[PDB]
Amino acid sequence: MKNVGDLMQRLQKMMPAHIKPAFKTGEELLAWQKEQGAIRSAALERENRAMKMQRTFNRSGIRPLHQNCSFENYRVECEGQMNALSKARQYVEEFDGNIASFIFSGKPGTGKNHLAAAICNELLLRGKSVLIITVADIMSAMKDTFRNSGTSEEQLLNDLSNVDLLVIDEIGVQTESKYEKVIINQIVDRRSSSKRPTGMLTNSNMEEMTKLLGERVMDRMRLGNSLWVIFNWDSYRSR
Amino acid sequence: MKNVGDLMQRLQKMMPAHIKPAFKTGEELLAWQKEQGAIRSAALERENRAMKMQRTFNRSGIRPLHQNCSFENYRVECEGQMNALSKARQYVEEFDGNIASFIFSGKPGTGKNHLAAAICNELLLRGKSVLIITVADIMSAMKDTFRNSGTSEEQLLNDLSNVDLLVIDEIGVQTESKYEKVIINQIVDRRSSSKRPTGMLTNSNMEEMTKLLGERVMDRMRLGNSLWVIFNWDSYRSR
Amino acid sequence: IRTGQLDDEDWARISGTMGILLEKRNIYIDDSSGLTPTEVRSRARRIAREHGGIGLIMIDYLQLMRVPALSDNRTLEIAEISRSLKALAKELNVPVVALSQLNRSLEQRADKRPVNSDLRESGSIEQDADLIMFIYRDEVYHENSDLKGIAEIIIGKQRNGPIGTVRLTFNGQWSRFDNYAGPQY
DNA sequence: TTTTTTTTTTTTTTTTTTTTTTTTTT
Ligand SMILES: Nc1ncnc2c1ncn2[C@@H]1O[C@H](COP(=O)(O)OP(=O)(O)O)[C@@H](O)[C@H]1O
Ligand SMILES: Nc1ncnc2c1ncn2[C@@H]1O[C@H](COP(=O)(O)OP(=O)(O)O)[C@@H](O)[C@H]1O
């Protein structure tokens, strides 16, 4: 009824001019489809990694309180602030494949979570996973996992070990639970021994910590540049 | 249409000279085939045994912190170190068909996992199965196994029994749990009763440990040369 | 496309794929419903003699194929169908993609990956074939999945090649499977 | 006969850690 030019012309009756069909042949169309497919695959994988964190846990790795939490806003007051801040910077930069833990010890209100979240904000741009979490919330996850037979705590610990940068928060408290001890040592065991990093946040001293944190745990924490940064300062929000 | 001559000539047209078949006959064919059959079956059963615990679980064997763990990076300090290294070597050399266990004891930072992993590194290349593991990780696997009915704690225990050298780590902590004790003693019962070796790694003394590993399990471990080898040094990473 | 709500880049890519497909004149779609293997062989032999020789056939939802002789017995109907299609493929020396539905046996199984058994009728199709490859897309069954946008092609039989489980990405907004250069399987 | 899909009723087989408040008597 109608031929090549006539059909394409009946179709240019719709589309305006200066139309570069962009392929003209098959040898190129397959290649373009290949390219776009690899791109969409990468994006899809990113999205599903994110969803895996949202399903295994709740609470997207950084919270909306420490979300706008880069290095820049960290107001400077003293020299230890540089000893912490620039050390954090080189810790981020030298993080790649580095077995380098860290413990920020210090009083509350000092910006421990703040710099530990600046780290994580950077590593999100790097393309890695993160999680700031409280041990209370971890044990809550455990004890909720006990309920349902769809997820299990070994699956949970594997989800934790599969994380790139895990950090723990509110550890200095002397909760005496055997079942907290067996988890808090096992996690860092499964991470360090699996050749992955981790870094805690505390309010305590080394020996204050070392009876709660077993000798093995401190041993598997102290590697390379173990980063024993400490805050011996006055709280921020009282200013 | 065609005979041996013309056909094999057209065959050499494909493939060049000096391709001599190395069979020439009907019996050597089947003989070498059976030879390769058994050789293939060797690595086949090897792959089965080694993929059990990488399909169900991860990292079955030595784990990447203690992988690059030759005997020779072992730093020399004292006669205790000489005793440890030398006795480890002779334990490996007299390993085959020899019911001999090991219970290292002492503080961390001394080379328990180090020596166990050097041992297991060698017994890999000798052709034997190995698994360094935490008791917490075993119990985590159990508590996950209760979920699915396809697998079973029976299946995992028989798999551990199928291992040549089962070893245990971080047993020193005093968890009194019934379901932990049944596993920790039943495993040794199954292995030793089936004429199979293993060995443990702890911190405490024989008596303080023996309420955790029953008199039964301890005496059933202490066969041949029990190899109690003890470390009473300072931590390595303190240096 | 079925709304006309499209932009210049899209108008262009349509022009391109169109102006490609017109130049070759490969494809030949039959929009007739209740065909028989007789008619399939006829049409295929017709496109064969004229246009060189064909290279591929696709048959959507095989079970609609008929042969009124065996309309009283359905299993034998499908058997005749399958033999006819195999003989066709052997005649013209091409492949014959022949879709087929599955039965509702894999629903009461908790795995939902189809097996070679779960074919819609007669079980000859699990015998007359050189290749089966089912499809499985977990996001249909599991909303709790971290495996979405991902459709895997469970091979289930191949007489001259390996079994497997291939993995690909589904984007049904434009009705395509694409390659999944991702982790292993 | 033997295949196949569909619904409906019967039996049988399979199951751990957690956290608390007590509250004694020294
Ligand atoms: N040097 C600083 N500059 C800017 N904000 C700070 C500083 N130190 C503390 N803060 C603020 O104080 C809050 C508490 O610090 P954070 O580390 O989150 O808690 P904690 O001090 O208990 O670890 C943060 O929300 C942060 O905004
Ligand atoms: N004799 C030694 N020479 C060199 N390094 C050692 C020695 N003993 C222990 N180490 C090191 O100390 C760390 C702890 O040793 P290991 O036995 O693996 O754990 P643990 O000391 O807790 O048993 C390891 O990183 C190991 O390399």
HEC states along chain A? Answer: CCCHHHHHHHHHCCCCCCCCCCCCCHHHHHHHHHHHHHHHHHHHHHHHHHHHHHHHCCCCCCCCCCCCCCCCCCCCCCHHHHHHHHHHHHHHHCCCCCCCCEEEEECCCCCHHHHHHHHHHHHHHHCCCEEEEEHHHHHHHHHHHCCCCCCCHHHHHHHHHCCCEEEEECCCCCCCCHHHHHHHHHHHHHHHCCCCCCEEEECCCHHHHHCCCCHHHHHHHCCCCCCCCEECCCCCCCC
Distance from CA of C26 to the nearest CA of A (A): 13
Q: Which helix (H) or strand (E) holds B192?
A: helix B178-193
Q: How many CA atoms lie within 13 A of A22 on its CB side?
A: 15
Distance from CA of A47 to the nearest CA of C (A): 9
> Residue-wise over B85-103: b if at least 16 C-beta within 10 A, else e?
beebeebbeebeeeeebbb
DSSP state of B167: E
Residue of A nearest to C177 (CA): A37
Pairing of strands A230-231, A199-202: unpaired
Residue among A71, A236, A237, A239 whose CB has most ligand 1 atoms within 8 A, to mutate: A236
Q: Subunits with at least 3 CB pairs below 8 A relative to chain B? A: A
Two structure tokens written together for C139? 């996001």
CB A12 within 8 A of CB C113: no
Distance CA B205, CA B214 (A): 13
Q: B235 contacts in A (CB within 8 Å)?
A: 215, 219
Cβ-in-10-Å burial (0-12, 13-18, 19+) of C85 comes to: buried
CB A125 within 8 A of CB A165: no
CB B133 within 8 A of CB B167: yes
What resolution in angstroms, rounded to 1 decimal? 3.4
- For B44-231, give the CATH class: alpha beta
- Number of Cβ within 10 Å of residue A141's Cβ equals 19
DSSP state of B54: H
Q: Which of A195, A215, A223 sits opposite B108 (nearest CB)?
A: A215
- The phi, psi pair for C105, rounded to 5°, reads -95, -35
Whether A207 and chain B come into contact, CB under 8 Å, resolves to no
Q: Which amino acid is at B62?
A: I
Question: In B35-123, which ranges are E strands?
Answer: 102-106
Two structure tokens written together for B32? 């070498």
Distance, CA of A143 to C1' of D19, in Å: 8
Residue of A nearest to C179 (CA): A37
Boundaries of every domain in chain A: 47-231
The ligand 2 site (C-beta within 6 Å) comprises: A 216, 219; B 66, 74-75, 81, 108-114, 236-237
Quick one: C1-185 is in which CATH superfamily?
P-loop containing nucleotide triphosphate hydrolases (3.40.50.300)
DSSP state of B127: T
Name which residue sits closest to atom 9 of ligand 2, judged by CA: B111
Q: How many helices (H) and strands (E) does chain C have?
A: 3, 8
Question: In B38-99, which ranges are E strands?
Answer: none
Whether C17 and chain A come into contact, CB under 8 Å, resolves to yes
Interface residue of A48, A49, A56 to substitute, partner C, most C CBs within 10 Å? A48
Cβ-in-10-Å burial (0-12, 13-18, 19+) of B149 comes to: exposed
Please choose, from the candidates A77, A79, A86, the residue with its C-alpha nearest in 3D space to the C-alpha of residue A115.
A86
Two structure tokens written together for A169? 């928060």
Chain length of chain C: 185
Whether the CB of A236 is less than 7 Å away from nucleic strand D comes out as no
Two structure tokens written together for C57? 């056939």
Distance from CA of A139 to the nearest CA of B (A): 14
Nearest-Å Rg of the Cα atoms of chain C is 19
Two structure tokens written together for A168? 């723990």
CB A99 within 8 A of CB A226: no
Two structure tokens written together for A16? 């305006």
DSSP state of B60: -
Distances (CA, A) of B21 to A135, A144, B2: 68, 66, 21
Query: Could you identify the atom of ligand 2 that is nearest to the CA of residue B69?
Result: 27
Distance CA B27, CA B20 (A): 17
Distance CA A155, CA A145 (A): 10
Please choose, from the candidates C97, C101, C74, the residue with its C-alpha nearest in 3D space to the C-alpha of residue C86.
C97
Please choose, from the candidates B231, B68, B238, the residue with its C-alpha nearest in 3D space to the C-alpha of residue A215.
B238
- C177: helix, coil or strand? strand
Q: Which amino acid is at C68?
A: P
Distance CA C83, CA A99 (A): 63
Q: How far is the CA of A109 from the centre of ligand 1 (A)?
A: 5
The ligand 1 site (C-beta within 6 Å) comprises: A 73-75, 108-114, 236-237
- For A47-231, give the CATH class: alpha beta
Please choose, from the candidates C148, B25, C17, the residue with its C-alpha nearest in 3D space to the C-alpha of residue A49.
C148
Two structure tokens written together for C107? 């629903």
Q: Do A41 and C178 touch (CB under 8 A)?
A: yes
